[PDB]
Structure formats: C-alpha cells, structure tokens
Design a protein around this ligand. Structure first.
Ligand SMILES: [Cu+]
Length: 122
C-alpha cells in the first residue's frame, strides 16, 4: 500500500501510472528527487486531484508561490499532496483510499512543472 516515485532535474517523474490495491485502507507515496538542483529552481511536489480539478489547483498554486509549496492553502480539491522538495530531499504523503470514488478520473502532478500521471484503483 505504498509506491516510491522520483522527480529529477529534467522535470520527469519516473512513473506515469500508480495503481492502488483495493485491499488498502490508506496509501502512501514516497517522493524523492535525484539530481543536483535545489528547491527554489527545480522543486517538485506530488499532488492528487480529479482530472477536472487539476487546472485550478495548478493555477491557484502558482499564485500562492514558493513558500506555500506552490499550493493554495486548504485547497479542498487536493485529495493528497507532499511538500515541495529539492534534490536529495524526501517527503511522504498518506491518504485514505476511501476518498477515491468510483467512476472518477484521478491524476497526480507537480504544480510548478509540466509533469503528470494517472492514479487508478486496481
Ligand atoms: Cu516537478
């Protein structure tokens, strides 16, 4: 009921797709950042929302800026998020799998940089 994911200096996540076993009550994403660039220039986060909500989350996050991890505080569209990390840093986020609803399309993404993928219940 966890996955390890990396974001590198070339703005790439090392997976495009996360699958969550339906046996899981909670799920944990462990984000890391191979490379050499720091948080203020090549910081990554990992953010989960519906596909429909992603644009507003990113836009509002960029308006909130760097010290708010490029996320709007208390954004109710964000189902789960890590903090922003630079190279060498790590952050894990855990969420309740029952927040993922049948029939919905979930996406994971970084807010400052064009990086995204799918999250699906197995
Ligand atoms: Cu990123």
């Amino acid at each position: 009921c966890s996955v390890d994911i990396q974001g590198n200096d070339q703005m790439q996540f090392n997976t495009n797709a996360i699958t969550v076993d339906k046996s899981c009550k909670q799920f944990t994403v462990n984000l890391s950042h191979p490379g050499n660039l720091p948080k203020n220039v090549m910081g990554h986060n990992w953010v989960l929302s519906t596909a429909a909500d992603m644009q507003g989350v990113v836009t509002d996050g960029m308006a909130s800026g760097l010290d708010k991890d490029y996320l709007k505080p208390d954004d109710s569209r964000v189902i789960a998020h890590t903090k922003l990390i630079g190279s060498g840093e790590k952050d894990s986020v855990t969420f309740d799998v029952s927040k993922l609803k049948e029939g919905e399309q979930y996406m994971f993404f970084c807010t400052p940089h064009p990086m995204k993928g799918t999250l699906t219940l197995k």
